[PDB]
């Protein structure tokens, strides 16, 4: 219950231990603008010409991370040491265009109620392992502090080929989603 | 080149675990009367927080007792500023010359690749394009001349 005509996330920082695992991203009406690659300390535009004119200085992301990192240690020992309610995911699949056997389309798996945000989302063609033409998103944010996520597959829509999304989480063991309607 | 700016994550001095931090700027007409929340979150519990409408670092839980003093006595004025220093700056200088003046037009009735959201269930595709499901065909959208039909 908080409304208004638009919303910006010029924060969004998550970090988690053990293994110590971070992301920094900015959203605007629930669409990732960029994410900072913390390893190559650089800004990664969700849509290449999104930062044609516009700049983002990555070191802001890096700082926010290292706050959270420090902020963890100090809220770890102050919840006694409470760990995280693993919740189990909730895939769904649909496509980009409506389907056009001959010409490219793109197939997207939508995984909701993730937490903590580590996951594999892999693609299956007739249960052969598909690694090419695949784009994932960063962990987007849900009002309740889960995350959601989004894997993308470019393909030549030939009936007969059949398409499967596999979601190897923790709270769940896998879960495939064959498509639907 | 214009520059997108960022709300600043505040430190505190002193079996898997998650920290989170959200930097929420909400806008009404843009410009006029604007709001800002910064959540400081443990696992799923939002322990600490700053609302633009409270102008002070509250807590929400029992785990923001030994935070929310130290955030007012270190981040308070800088943070209050964030409303204009960052929320505002970003709205005016960056979203307007991109993520508002780009729209994209659409394509038992289902319609693809449209932006922004307003049209006349709803799916977010998260690649700055949209879809919706409703049960000649008239889809009226604010990106258009002649509200495309067939």
């Amino acid at each position, epitope marked *: 219950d908080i409304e208004a005509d638009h919303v910006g996330f010029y924060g969004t920082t998550v970090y988690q231990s053990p293994g110590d695992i971070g992301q920094y991203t900015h959203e605007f009406d629930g669409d990732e603008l960029f994410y900072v690659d913390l390893d190559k300390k650089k800004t990664v535009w969700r849509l290449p010409e999104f930062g044609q004119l516009i700049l983002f200085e*990555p070191q*802001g*992301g890096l700082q926010c991370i290292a706050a959270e990192k420090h902020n963890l240690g100090i809220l770890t020992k102050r919840s006694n040491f409470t760990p995280a309610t693993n919740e189990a995911p909730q895939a769904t699949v649909f496509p980009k265009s409506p389907v056009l056997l001959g010409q490219p389309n793109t197939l997207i798996c939508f995984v909701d109620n993730i937490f903590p945000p580590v996951i594999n989302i892999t693609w299956l063609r007739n249960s052969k392992s598909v690694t090419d033409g695949v784009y994932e998103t960063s962990f987007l944010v849900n009002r309740d502090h889960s995350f959601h996520k989004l894997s993308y597959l470019t393909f030549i829509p030939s009936d007969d080929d059949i398409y499967d999304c596999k979601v190897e989480h923790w709270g769940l063991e896998p879960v495939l989603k064959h498509w639907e309607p | 080149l214009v520059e997108r*700016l960022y709300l600043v994550c505040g430190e505190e001095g002193a079996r898997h675990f998650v920290h989170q931090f959200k930097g929420e700027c909400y806008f009404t007409n843009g410009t006029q009367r604007i709001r800002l929340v910064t959540r400081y979150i443990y696992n799923r519990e939002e322990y600490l927080r700053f609302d633009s409408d409270v102008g002070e670092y509250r807590a929400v839980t029992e785990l923001g007792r030994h935070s929310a003093e130290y955030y007012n006595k*270190q981040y308070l004025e800088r943070t209050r*500023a964030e409303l204009d*220093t960052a929320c505002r*700056h970003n709205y005016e200088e960056t979203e307007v010359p991109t993520s508002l003046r780009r729209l994209e037009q659409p394509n038992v009735c289902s319609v693809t690749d449209f932006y922004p959201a307003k049209i006349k269930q709803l799916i977010r595709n998260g690649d700055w394009t949209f879809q919706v499901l409703v049960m000649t065909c008239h889809v009226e959208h604010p990106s258009l001349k002649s509200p495309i039909t067939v």
Partner: T-cell receptor
Amino acid sequence: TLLEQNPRWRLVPRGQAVNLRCILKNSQYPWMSWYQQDLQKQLQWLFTLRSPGDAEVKSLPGADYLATRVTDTELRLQVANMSQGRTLYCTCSAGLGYEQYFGPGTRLTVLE
Amino acid sequence: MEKVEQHESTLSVREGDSAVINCTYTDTASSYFPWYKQEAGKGLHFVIDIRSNVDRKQSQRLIVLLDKKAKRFSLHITATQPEDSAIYFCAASPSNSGGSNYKLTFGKGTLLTVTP
């Protein structure tokens, strides 16, 4: 208050090398930067070094600088190839968006 | 970069005149302007600051102010006093750009001598 620099006054048989150490005296001001004031007054930022073992080099007209945050409360500068004089000020700060508090500085005059 | 340039390299005014120092900065993201004070080859002393939410601040005799749009900002020492006499530097920093949050860009100095 706040910071102790060391030394205050030094000659630099040119180009050659010499160094100095600033010590924090209160941890409400944890961020510690380095500034140079050149010979016609005029401050330049050099380094801000947050976390210990964080350490960098800047080559500047006309000196060369190895700066290194060695502890929670020590900061160090080595300065060499020192061309003409300058004064070095250690700072410290409670944070981002917040005033710097300057040290008592170190004057460096070259010696031919 | 930020260039932050102090129009005016000297001022003499005598007691009870309002000394005014003027600066400009280039970079539209700057939002934290502190001013500093140096007497007689000693250290710098933080004097006052101001943020880009507000257009003016005022404290004790001093008052500082800021036309974001103009990218100009000024410090007004008021009812001057021989003790005030020093080199005053203005400075800038974008408090919400991570590239330089942690640093200050400084003007050149302005030497204020306030005469008995």
